Amino acid sequence: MEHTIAVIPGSFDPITYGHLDIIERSTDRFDEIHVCVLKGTFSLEERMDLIEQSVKHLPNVKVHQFSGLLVDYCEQVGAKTIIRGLRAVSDFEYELRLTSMNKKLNNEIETLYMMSSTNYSFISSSIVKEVAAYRADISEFVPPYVEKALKKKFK
Numbered sequence: 792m793e794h795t796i797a798v799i800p801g802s803f804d805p806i807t808y809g810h811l812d813i814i815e816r817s818t819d820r821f822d823e824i825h826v827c828v829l830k831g832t833f834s835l836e837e838r839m840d841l842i843e844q845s846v847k848h849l850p851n852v853k854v855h856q857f858s859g860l861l862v863d864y865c866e867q868v869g870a871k872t873i874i875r876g877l878r879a880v881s882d883f884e885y886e887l888r889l890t891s892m893n894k895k896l897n898n899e900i901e902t903l904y905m906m907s908s909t910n911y912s913f914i915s916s917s918i919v920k921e922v923a924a925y926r927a928d929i930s931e932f933v934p935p936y937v938e939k940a941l942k943k944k945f946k
């Protein structure tokens with residue numbers, strides 16, 4: 792096993808414990824992990840900062856951004872794996888299109904799906920921002936820094 796790099800894509804708007812769980816479960820399986828923000832409630836720089844403060848405890852996790860094909864990013868940084876989470880509330884056909892296309896564009900990159908834990912298998916950033924907008928207790932869905940920002944925004 793040479794030096795392995797895995798990219799965990801998303802628009803992380805914002806990053807939730809759901810995403811965070813996938814990142815943490817991945818750190819010990821690749822030498823290098825890149826959380827890449829591609830393609831909104833929070834600005835791009837805002838979202839990177841939120842991810843950053845949320846993964847300070849994970850030394851091998853980098854936070855970068857990219858505009859363009861995710862596969863081009865992977866080819867640039869030498870990443871050969873794309874990590875995606877599979878949840879009960881996932882859009883299966885959407886995942887099929889997305890991943891099948893990435894495979895066509897560059898098959899030297901494998902997308903690996905990790906199934907979400909039962910407690911995060913039902914949330915998404917949308918539903919979370921929604922209840923946050925109505926000032927519900929959201930400490931269960933997002934890390935401290937993110938919750939602080941969401942509240943700040945939806946005050």
Ligand SMILES: Nc1ncnc2c1ncn2[C@@H]1O[C@H](COP(=O)(O)OS(=O)(=O)O)[C@@H](OP(=O)(O)O)[C@H]1O
Pocket residue numbers: 800801802803804807808809810811813876877878907911914915916917918
């Ligand atoms: N691991 C995990 N846990 C919980 N939720 C997750 C996870 N990964 C992706 N998502 C949510 O799936 C929706 C689409 O993801 P993205 O907007 O990042 O697009 S992309 O497919 O990742 O490119 C989007 O939620 P929506 O708010 O319903 O659009 C992402 O926040």
